[PDB]
């Protein structure tokens, strides 16, 4: 969810028109996943959250990416400095599960926003 | 119920003795009393507490006359005489 | 001493000597409570030590109470409690 | 007959610990020192668990008539100085070592107690909002 | 402004799912009227054991069951993500942006995300 | 946290009303005085001085307009 | 007049010093922030000093007025550290009220503080030192 | 600005007896009173433990305005002072140092002597002594009488 | 909100306060009268919890662990509930400070992990060293 922030905001300014408002808010909505894991784990928002943005966004003098793009959200529970590599614990997510969850979650919020009126009756 | 009228005065007298009981000795508990005029005074002396307490109860005012004679005759024990008085009332 | 001498009396007055001895133990009990010490624990230590010894230590601590204070405290309390129980009613008088 | 019934339960399991607050006091003191070497919020949390272990000797002294306030300060005095195995006498209140009186307690009780009590307490606090239906 | 209050009704159940995903998650004890206690950590199973009042809540429940039937995994990812899309859209309602272009914006952003997977 | 919300809503309630006082197209405003008169001008400096405020954060915003 | 006693007056002393401590809670240290005092007239003031706030602080309570004279005692002599004194005295009242359920006598609580106060001064005097580190290091430099 | 900076310097150097501030007085005394409370006892040990733990509120609330976490700073500060008093009476030390302070500007733990925060001893002694004088008069009131 | 956790803490306190005097062979006993009007008096901590029938869902956890303590072991049925409840009281003020329950759980599990190795060190088990199968008993 954090890595998709840099790619979606890049396409926001590329598409002209009023669609820029929905594209920017679409990438910000992915910040709830790292914030939920950091808040429930007792970690400070002013500490872990700014380190997550700097993990996937760095200044590299070159066109080819380098360093480590695999740094995720760490639960901690004992102690740590910054974040750690996810490839050490080999925690991955299948594409079939992630891709299917996007289309379902998109149509779920679409139905709620499309309904401006609700009619009910007592039984 | 001629005695129940007196029993109501005995219970009210034991409440005053229990309040002064906590102030006995140098380590006793002080009492805060705010006068109607706005003066705020505090001390552990039992004679000064009952003097500014302005007790409206007729029987409870007898402890003030005893405390006045306690300081005028012996000079000490104004707090202990209130506790000893309430002990006989409880028995 | 008054607890043992209470058997020498007879009738209703004999029971008063038993309650009068317990009414005198409130003064030493309050002194133990206001000092932070355990209430009942210090009172039990008083009856234990005063049996063998007599007035023995506050003398080393320089604590001396004159006898007239302890005498007037009982005398004034006897007249104060008497003036209370003798009032059987009160009414507005002016 | 009384001597056989005591060693009977000790034959099934030979792993025993010193009872009467002995073992409970030694654990509470060591966890305070081990927490001092652990940085972070876990330092004050471990110290809270050591204080929670004092409720076991408390109720034992209160139900027997002893004063839990005085026995707690008198035991800790001799606990941190010299011999750390000093326990609490069940009959007469006084300081003493349960190792001399040969008073033992099975260790399997404390092992399952510390595991069950800590887990059951952590499960209740693990949820922020509980929604339970009625019927 | 019921469209704003409709998000608040889901927000009450949003914090329930925020305590599910992650190692801090915990099962919820539910006592049925028949005298049977069902205890499970899965949030999709809990939705069947909860009484739904507002009919708009059932929309997210029906979408959550789709994740369990087909792929069987990611039920917490669907409900939490769908609840956050309503919070970011609430600011656009107060801003004056119509909900029609908001729906069209998600369709363009969804096709761009699938190509990057 | 309720005190931080009251501090924001105190200064914003004054700012949201004067939003129509900006620019040459600024719309006129009408205040209701106890006297039969009224303030027909759209000048923000004259309107803010006649508005009675309660929360002290709005009082600090009035002193800033006098210096500006 | 009315007369109260028991555990009700002990709970009022904690609630009285709680609102007073919250006034000096955010003003502690140089990192503190200013606050405003609004009276019935409608005027106010802006200051970052917690000592001047306690002088104009209006609180009706027997224990609350004690801290008023305590704040003026430190200002007329030292003039600094008044904010830290109120915070210390506020926590001592909250922890002492919790000992009521433990059947702890208040005089023992007071006696325990007087014995610890005299022994704490001796421990503080052991770590006191004059100006040092003049050669090889710098001390007064980082102050300015 | 030089006269204002000199004012802080001349007031500190006026008293030859100074003490490092920033929480060094309250934190170092908290651990010392833990083992010292056993030497007294007799129902007074519980009052000393609550008196020592009541001093941790000063560094706690101080870190609130600095946006730093008050739970981590107070906890980690006790860990450093723990090993500082272990080798102190032995008159020998290697990695153990005293006077650990709290710097909220840079967000790190450094000595307040080198950091530039110094306070006189007279100010600290009279502040702690007068704080307990008002606490005694409050706890001794069991009754409130108002006409 | 946070009121659900506070309601769960006070649920275990009301059950603990009844079981506090029951610790020890000389401790107090709890009397429970079932709707059948059958009065039973016993010092067993497991029998007392079975007759309470607490509606609070999280309070049944202390009853479930008490039945397993009396079955697989048989000793410590009352002490496991008091220890679990007293540990809950120490964590009550930690909620108002904003500390999440994640680090609270990891802090206690760290002490228990160090306690298992501590109990084995404190417990003295000897067989062929300065003892035998007889002199030991």
């Amino acid at each position: 969810e954090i890595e998709l922030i840099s790619r979606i905001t890049k396409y926001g300014e590329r598409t002209p028109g009023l669609l820029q408002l929905a594209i920017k808010q679409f990438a910000v909505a992915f910040e709830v996943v790292p914030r939920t894991l950091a808040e429930t784990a007792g970690l400070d928002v002013n500490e872990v959250l700014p380190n997550l943005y700097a993990a996937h966004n760095v200044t590299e003098p070159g066109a080819v990416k380098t360093d480590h793009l695999y740094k995720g959200v760490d639960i901690d529970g004992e102690s740590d400095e910054g974040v750690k590599d996810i490839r050490e614990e080999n925690i991955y997510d299948m594409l079939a599960t992630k891709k299917f969850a996007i289309n379902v979650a998109t149509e779920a919020a679409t139905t709620v926003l499309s309904i401006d009126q609700i009619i009910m009756a007592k039984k | 119920k001629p005695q129940e009228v007196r029993k109501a005065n005995i219970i009210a007298a034991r409440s005053v003795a229990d309040a002064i009981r906590t102030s006995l000795g140098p380590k006793g508990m002080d009492k805060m009393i705010k006068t109607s005029r706005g003066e705020i005074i505090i001390s552990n002396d039992g004679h000064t507490i009952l003097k500014q307490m302005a007790i409206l109860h007729p029987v409870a005012r007898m402890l003030v006359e005893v405390s006045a004679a306690q300081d005028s005759e012996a000079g000490d024990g104004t707090t202990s005489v209130v506790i000893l008085t309430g002990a006989l009332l409880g028995a | 001493r008054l607890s043992k001498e209470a058997r020498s009396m007879e009738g209703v007055q004999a029971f008063i000597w038993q309650e009068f001895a317990s009414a005198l133990e409130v003064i030493p009990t309050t002194l133990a409570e206001n000092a932070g010490l355990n209430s009942i624990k210090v009172v039990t230590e008083l009856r234990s030590k005063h049996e063998n010894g007599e007035l023995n230590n506050t003398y080393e601590e320089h604590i001396l109470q004159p006898v007239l204070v302890s005498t007037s405290a009982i005398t004034l309390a006897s007249e104060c409690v008497k003036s209370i129980l003798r009032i059987d009613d009160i009414a507005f008088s002016r | 007959h009384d001597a056989i019934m005591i060693v009977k339960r000790a034959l099934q399991n030979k792993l025993i610990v010193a009872g009467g607050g002995a073992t409970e006091m030694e654990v509470s003191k060591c966890l305070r020192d081990y927490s001092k070497t652990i940085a972070g919020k876990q330092q004050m949390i471990i110290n809270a668990f050591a204080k929670a272990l004092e409720v076991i000797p408390r109720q034992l002294c209160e139900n027997a008539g002893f004063d839990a306030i005085e026995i707690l300060n008198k035991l800790r005095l001799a606990h941190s100085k010299g011999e750390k195995w000093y326990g609490v006498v069940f009959e007469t209140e006084n300081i003493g070592d349960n190792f001399a009186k040969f008073v033992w307690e099975p260790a399997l009780v404390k092992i399952n107690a510390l595991n069950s009590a800590t887990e059951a307490t952590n499960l209740i606090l693990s949820v922020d909002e509980t929604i339970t239906n009625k019927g | 402004g019921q469209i704003i209050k409709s998000i608040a009704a889901i927000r009450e159940l949003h914090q329930m799912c925020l305590t599910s995903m992650g190692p801090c998650g915990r099962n919820k004890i539910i006592v049925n009227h028949l005298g049977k206690i069902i205890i499970t950590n899965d949030a999709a199973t809990m939705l069947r054991e909860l009484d739904i009042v507002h009919p708009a809540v059932k929309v997210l429940v029906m979408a959550t069951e789709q994740q369990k039937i087909d792929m069987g995994d990611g039920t917490n990812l669907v409900m939490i993500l769908a609840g956050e899309l309503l919070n970011v859209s609430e600011k656009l309602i107060s801003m004056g942006l119509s909900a029609v272009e908001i729906i069209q914006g998600y369709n363009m952003a969804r096709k761009f995300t699938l190509k990057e997977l | 946290r309720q005190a931080q919300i009251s501090n924001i809503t105190a200064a914003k309630a004054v700012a949201d009303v004067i939003r129509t006082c900006l620019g040459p197209k600024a719309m006129l405003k009408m205040l209701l005085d106890p006297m039969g008169g009224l303030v027909l001008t759209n000048d923000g400096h004259a309107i803010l001085r006649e508005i009675d405020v309660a929360h002290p954060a709005a009082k600090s915003m009035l002193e800033l307009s006098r210096t500006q | 007049g009315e007369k109260i006693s028991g555990d009700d007056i002990r709970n009022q002393n904690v609630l009285a010093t709680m609102a007073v401590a919250n006034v000096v809670k955010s003003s502690l240290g140089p990192v503190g922030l200013d606050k405003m005092l609004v009276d019935d007239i409608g005027d106010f003031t802006v200051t970052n000093d917690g000592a001047t706030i306690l002088s104009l602080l209006d609180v009706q309570h027997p224990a609350g007025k004690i801290l008023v004279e305590l704040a003026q005692q430190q200002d007329r002599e030292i003039g600094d550290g008044t904010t830290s004194v109120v915070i210390i005295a506020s926590e001592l009242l909250k922890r002492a009220n919790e000992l009521v359920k433990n059947k702890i006598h208040p005089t023992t609580i007071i006696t325990g503080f007087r014995v610890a106060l005299r022994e704490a001064i001796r421990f503080i005097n052991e770590v006191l030192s004059t100006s040092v580190d003049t050669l090889g290091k710098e001390t007064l430099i980082n102050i300015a | 600005s030089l006269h204002d900076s000199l004012s802080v310097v001349k007031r500190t150097l006026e008293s030859g007896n100074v003490v490092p501030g920033g929480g060094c007085v309250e934190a170092a005394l908290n651990i010392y009173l833990d083992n010292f409370a056993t030497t007294v006892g007799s129902r007074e040990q519980l009052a000393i433990a609550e008196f020592a733990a009541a001093l941790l509120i000063i560094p706690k609330t101080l870190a609130v305005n600095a946006a730093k976490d008050s739970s981590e700073l107070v906890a980690k500060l006790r860990s450093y002072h723990a090993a500082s008093q272990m080798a102190k009476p032995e008159d020998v030390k290697r990695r153990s140092y005293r006077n650990y302070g709290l710097d909220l500007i840079r967000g790190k733990i450094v000595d307040e002597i080198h950091a530039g925060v110094l306070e006189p001893t007279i100010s600290k002694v009279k502040s702690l002594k007068s704080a307990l004088e008002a606490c005694v008069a409050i706890l001794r009131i069991d009754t409130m009488i108002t006409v | 909100g946070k009121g659900q956790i506070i309601s769960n803490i006070n649920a275990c306190v009301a059950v603990q306060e009844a079981l506090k005097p029951t610790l020890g062979p000389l401790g107090s006993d709890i009397l429970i009268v079932t709707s059948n009007q059958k009065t039973t008096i016993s010092n067993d901590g497991a029998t007392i919890l079975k007759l309470l029938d607490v509606v609070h869902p999280a309070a049944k956890t202390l009853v479930d662990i008490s039945r397993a303590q009396d079955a697989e072991v048989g000793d410590g049925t009352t002490s496991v509930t008091i220890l679990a409840g007293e540990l809950m009281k120490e964590a009550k003020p930690f909620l108002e400070e904003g500390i999440s329950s994640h680090l609270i759980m990891k802090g206690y599990r760290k002490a228990v992990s160090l306690a298992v190795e501590k109990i084995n060190e404190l417990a003295v088990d000897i067989t062929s060293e300065k003892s035998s199968g007889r002199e030991l008993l």
Side-chain angles (χ1 to χ4, degrees):
Chain A
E1 295 84 357
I2 296 171
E3 183 178 2
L4 294 174
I5 295 171
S6 296
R7 294 183 181 276
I8 294 170
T9 58
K10 183 178 179 180
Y11 296 140
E13 296 301 321
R14 182 178 181 172
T15 299
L18 295 175
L19 296 175
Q20 294 178 336
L21 296 175
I23 294 171
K24 293 177 179 177
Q25 294 300 321
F26 179 80
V28 176
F30 294 160
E31 294 178 351
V32 63
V33 176
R35 182 171 294 105
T36 300
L37 296 175
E39 183 178 2
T40 59
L43 296 175
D44 187 5
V45 177
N46 292 337
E47 294 177 351
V48 176
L49 178 63
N51 290 336
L52 296 174
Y53 176 78
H56 294 82
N57 189 340
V58 295
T59 299
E60 296 302 321
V64 176
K65 294 177 179 178
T66 186
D67 188 4
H68 300 290
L69 296 175
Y70 298 140
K71 294 177 179 177
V73 177
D74 188 3
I75 305 301
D76 290 344
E78 294 177 350
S79 178
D80 188 4
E81 183 178 2
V83 296
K84 64 181 179 181
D85 291 344
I86 304 301
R87 62 180 296 176
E88 294 178 351
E89 294 177 350
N90 290 283
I91 295 171
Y92 296 138
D93 186 5
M94 294 183 286
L95 177 62
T97 300
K98 179 62 174 172
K99 183 178 179 180
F100 178 80
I102 295 171
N103 291 337
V104 176
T106 299
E107 294 178 351
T110 299
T111 300
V112 176
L113 295 174
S114 63
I115 295 170
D116 290 344
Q117 185 174 355
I118 295 170
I119 303 301
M120 293 178 70
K122 294 177 179 177
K123 294 177 179 177
Chain B
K1 294 177 179 177
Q3 295 177 336
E4 296 301 321
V5 176
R6 183 180 65 256
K7 293 177 179 177
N9 292 337
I10 295 170
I11 295 171
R14 295 176 63 185
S15 296
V16 176
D18 290 344
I20 306 301
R21 181 178 181 172
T22 59
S23 296
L24 177 63
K27 302 299 183 181
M29 298 297 103
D30 291 344
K31 182 180 294 296
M32 181 64 74
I33 295 171
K34 183 178 179 180
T35 59
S36 63
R37 294 182 182 175
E39 183 178 2
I40 295 171
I41 60 172
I42 185 169
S43 178
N44 61 345
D45 186 5
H47 182 62
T48 59
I49 293 171
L50 296 175
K51 183 178 179 180
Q52 295 300 321
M53 183 171 175
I55 295 171
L56 296 175
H57 189 278
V59 177
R61 293 182 182 175
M62 294 177 182
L63 296 175
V64 176
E65 294 178 351
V66 175
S67 296
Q70 185 65 58
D71 181 67
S72 296
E73 296 301 321
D76 187 5
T78 59
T79 300
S80 63
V81 64
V82 176
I83 296 170
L84 178 62
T85 299
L88 296 175
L89 296 175
Chain C
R1 294 182 182 175
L2 295 175
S3 178
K4 294 177 179 177
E5 294 177 350
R7 294 182 182 175
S8 296
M9 295 300 294
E10 184 178 2
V12 177
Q13 294 178 336
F15 178 80
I16 296 171
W17 291 95
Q18 294 178 336
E19 295 301 321
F20 178 80
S22 296
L24 296 175
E25 294 178 351
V26 64
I27 295 170
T29 300
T30 300
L31 295 174
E33 294 177 351
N34 290 337
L37 296 175
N38 190 340
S39 63
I40 190 65
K41 183 178 179 180
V42 176
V43 177
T44 58
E45 294 178 351
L46 296 175
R47 292 177 64 86
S48 296
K49 294 177 179 178
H50 297 166
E51 182 67 14
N52 290 283
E54 182 178 2
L55 186 63
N56 62 345
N57 190 340
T58 58
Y59 177 78
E60 184 178 2
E61 296 301 321
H62 300 290
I63 295 170
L64 275 68
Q65 185 174 355
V67 64
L68 189 146
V69 174
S70 296
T71 299
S72 63
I74 296 170
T75 299
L76 295 175
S78 63
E79 294 178 350
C80 183
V81 176
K82 182 178 179 180
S83 63
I84 295 170
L85 296 175
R86 289 177 64 85
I87 303 301
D88 59 353
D89 188 4
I90 185 169
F92 177 80
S93 178
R94 181 178 181 172
Chain D
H1 184 198
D2 291 344
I4 295 171
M5 294 183 286
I6 294 171
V7 297
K8 180 179 76 179
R9 294 182 182 175
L11 178 63
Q12 185 64 59
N13 291 283
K14 291 189 295 184
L15 179 63
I16 59 173
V17 295
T23 300
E24 296 301 321
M25 183 64 73
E26 181 67 15
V27 176
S28 296
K29 182 173 178 290
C30 295
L31 294 175
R32 294 182 182 175
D33 290 344
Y34 296 141
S35 63
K36 294 176 179 177
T37 59
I38 295 171
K41 294 177 179 177
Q42 294 178 336
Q43 184 172 354
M44 294 183 286
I45 295 170
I46 295 171
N47 290 336
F49 178 80
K51 183 178 179 180
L53 296 175
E54 294 177 351
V55 65
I56 295 170
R58 181 177 181 171
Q59 295 300 321
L60 293 174
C61 296
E62 294 178 350
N63 291 336
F66 297 160
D67 186 5
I69 297 170
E70 294 177 350
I71 192 65
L72 178 63
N73 291 337
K74 293 177 179 177
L75 178 62
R76 182 171 293 105
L77 175 62
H79 182 63
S80 63
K81 183 178 179 180
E83 185 69 13
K84 295 177 179 178
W85 290 93
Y86 294 140
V88 176
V89 177
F90 295 160
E91 294 178 350
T92 300
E93 183 178 2
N94 190 340
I95 60 172
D97 185 4
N98 290 336
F99 178 80
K101 293 181 180 297
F102 296 157
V103 176
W104 58 272
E105 183 177 1
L108 295 175
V109 176
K110 293 181 180 297
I111 294 171
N112 290 336
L114 295 175
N115 291 336
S116 296
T118 300
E119 183 178 2
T121 300
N122 290 336
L123 294 175
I124 296 171
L125 295 174
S126 296
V127 59
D128 290 344
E129 294 177 351
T130 299
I131 295 171
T132 299
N133 291 337
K134 302 299 183 181
Chain E
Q2 185 63 59
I3 189 65
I4 296 169
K5 294 177 179 177
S6 296
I7 296 170
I10 296 171
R11 181 182 294 177
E12 294 177 351
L13 296 175
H14 183 198
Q15 294 178 336
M16 176 179 71
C17 296
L18 295 175
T19 59
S20 296
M21 177 179 71
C24 296
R26 181 181 180 274
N27 56 34
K28 271 69 180 180
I29 295 171
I30 295 170
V31 176
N32 291 336
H33 60 284
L34 296 175
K36 183 178 179 180
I37 295 170
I38 295 171
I39 295 170
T40 186
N41 290 283
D42 181 66
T45 301
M46 181 173 175
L47 296 175
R48 294 182 182 175
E49 296 301 321
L50 295 175
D51 186 5
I52 303 301
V53 176
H54 300 290
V57 177
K58 294 177 179 177
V59 176
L60 296 175
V61 176
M62 293 176 70
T64 300
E65 296 301 321
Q66 185 175 355
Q67 186 65 59
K68 180 62 174 172
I69 294 171
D70 290 344
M71 298 297 180
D73 186 5
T75 59
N76 290 337
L77 295 174
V78 176
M79 179 66 181
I80 294 171
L81 178 62
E84 184 67 14
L85 295 175
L86 297 175
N87 290 336
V88 296
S89 296
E90 183 178 2
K91 294 177 179 178
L92 296 175
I93 295 170
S94 296
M95 184 177 284
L97 177 62
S98 296
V100 176
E101 294 178 351
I102 296 170
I103 294 170
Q104 185 63 59
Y106 295 141
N107 291 337
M108 295 300 294
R110 181 177 64 84
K111 294 177 179 177
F112 295 160
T113 300
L114 296 175
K115 294 177 179 177
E116 296 301 321
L117 296 175
Chain F
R1 66 183 182 276
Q2 294 178 336
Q4 295 300 321
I5 296 171
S6 178
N7 291 337
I8 295 170
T9 59
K12 183 178 179 180
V14 176
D16 290 344
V17 176
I18 62 172
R19 293 183 181 276
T20 59
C21 296
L22 177 62
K25 301 299 183 181
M27 295 175 71
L28 296 175
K29 293 183 68 65
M30 183 177 285
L31 276 66
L32 177 63
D33 290 344
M35 295 300 294
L38 59 83
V39 176
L40 180 62
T41 188
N42 61 345
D43 186 5
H45 182 62
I47 294 171
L48 294 175
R49 293 175 296 180
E50 296 301 321
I51 293 171
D52 186 5
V53 296
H55 190 279
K59 294 177 179 177
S60 296
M61 296 300 293
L62 296 175
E63 294 177 351
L64 178 63
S65 63
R66 294 182 182 175
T67 300
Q68 186 65 59
Chain G
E2 296 302 321
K3 183 173 178 290
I4 61 172
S5 63
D7 290 344
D8 291 344
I9 185 169
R10 294 182 182 175
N11 290 337
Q12 294 300 321
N13 291 337
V14 176
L15 296 175
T17 188
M18 177 178 71
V20 176
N22 290 337
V23 176
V24 296
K25 183 178 179 180
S26 296
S27 296
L28 178 63
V31 296
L33 297 175
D34 58 9
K35 294 177 179 178
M36 294 177 182
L37 277 67
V38 175
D39 59 9
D40 290 344
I41 296 170
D43 189 4
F44 59 90
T45 187
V46 175
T47 187
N48 62 345
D49 186 5
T52 59
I53 295 170
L54 296 175
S55 296
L56 296 175
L57 177 63
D58 186 5
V59 174
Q60 295 300 321
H61 190 277
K65 294 177 179 178
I66 296 170
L67 296 175
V68 176
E69 294 178 350
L70 178 63
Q72 294 178 336
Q73 185 174 355
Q74 295 300 321
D75 291 344
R76 294 182 182 175
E77 182 67 15
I78 296 170
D80 187 5
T82 300
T83 300
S84 63
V85 175
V86 177
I87 296 170
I88 294 171
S90 296
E91 183 67 15
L92 295 174
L93 296 175
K94 183 178 179 180
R95 294 183 181 276
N97 190 30
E98 294 178 350
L99 296 175
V100 176
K101 294 177 179 177
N102 290 337
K103 294 177 179 177
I104 304 300
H105 191 277
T107 300
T108 300
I109 296 170
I110 295 170
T111 300
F113 294 162
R114 294 182 182 175
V115 176
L117 178 63
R118 294 182 182 175
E119 296 301 321
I121 296 171
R122 181 177 64 84
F123 177 79
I124 294 171
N125 291 337
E126 294 177 350
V127 297
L128 294 175
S129 178
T130 59
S131 178
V132 295
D133 290 344
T134 59
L135 296 175
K137 293 177 179 177
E138 296 302 321
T139 59
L140 298 174
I141 302 300
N142 290 336
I143 295 172
Chain H
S1 64
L2 188 147
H3 297 165
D4 291 344
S5 296
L6 178 63
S7 63
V8 177
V9 177
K10 64 181 179 181
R11 292 181 182 175
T12 300
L13 296 175
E14 183 178 2
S15 178
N17 189 340
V18 296
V19 61
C24 296
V25 176
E26 295 84 357
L29 180 62
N30 188 30
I31 295 171
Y32 176 77
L33 294 175
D34 290 344
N35 291 336
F36 178 80
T38 59
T39 59
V40 176
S42 178
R43 294 182 181 175
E44 294 178 351
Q45 185 174 355
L46 296 175
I48 296 171
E50 295 301 321
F51 177 80
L55 296 175
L56 296 175
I57 191 65
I58 302 301
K60 183 178 179 180
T61 59
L62 178 63
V64 176
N65 291 336
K68 302 299 182 181
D69 187 4
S70 63
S71 296
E72 294 178 350
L73 295 175
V74 175
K76 293 177 179 177
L77 179 63
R78 182 179 181 273
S79 296
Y80 296 140
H81 295 166
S84 296
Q85 294 178 336
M86 294 177 182
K88 179 62 174 172
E90 294 178 350
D91 291 344
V92 61
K93 62 182 178 181
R94 182 182 64 196
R95 300 289 182 268
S96 178
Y97 296 139
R98 59 176 182 183
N99 291 336
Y100 295 141
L102 296 175
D103 186 4
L104 296 174
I105 295 170
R106 293 173 296 180
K108 62 182 294 180
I109 294 170
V110 296
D111 185 4
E112 296 302 321
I113 295 170
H114 182 62
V117 176
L118 295 175
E119 295 301 321
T121 300
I122 296 170
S123 178
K124 300 299 183 181
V125 175
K126 293 177 179 177
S127 296
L128 178 63
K129 183 178 179 180
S130 296
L132 275 66
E133 294 178 350
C135 183
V136 174
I138 295 170
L139 296 175
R140 293 176 63 185
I141 296 170
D142 290 344
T143 299
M144 179 173 174
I145 295 171
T146 299
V147 176
Chain I
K2 294 177 179 177
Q4 185 64 59
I5 296 171
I6 296 170
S7 178
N8 291 337
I9 295 170
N10 290 337
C12 296
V13 175
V15 177
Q16 185 177 357
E17 293 177 350
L19 296 175
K20 292 176 179 177
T22 60
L23 178 62
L26 296 175
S28 296
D29 291 344
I30 295 171
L31 187 147
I32 295 171
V33 175
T34 59
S35 63
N36 291 336
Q37 295 300 321
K38 183 178 179 180
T39 299
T40 59
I41 295 98
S42 178
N43 61 345
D44 186 5
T47 300
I48 294 170
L49 295 175
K50 293 176 179 177
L51 296 175
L52 295 175
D53 291 344
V54 177
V55 178
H56 189 278
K60 294 177 179 177
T61 300
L62 296 175
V63 177
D64 291 344
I65 62 172
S66 296
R67 294 182 182 175
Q69 185 64 59
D70 182 67
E72 294 177 351
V73 176
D75 186 5
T77 300
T78 300
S79 64
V80 64
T81 300
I82 296 170
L83 178 62
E86 183 67 15
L87 179 63
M88 183 65 72
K89 183 178 179 180
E90 296 301 321
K92 183 178 179 180
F94 295 160
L95 177 63
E96 294 177 351
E97 296 302 321
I99 295 171
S100 178
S101 63
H102 182 63
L103 296 175
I104 296 170
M105 294 183 286
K106 301 299 183 181
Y108 296 141
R109 293 182 182 175
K110 179 62 174 172
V112 175
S113 296
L114 296 175
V116 175
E117 294 177 351
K118 180 62 174 172
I119 294 171
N120 291 337
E121 183 178 2
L122 295 175
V124 176
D125 186 4
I126 58 173
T127 59
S128 63
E129 296 301 321
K130 294 177 179 177
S131 64
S132 63
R134 293 173 296 180
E135 182 68 15
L136 177 63
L137 296 175

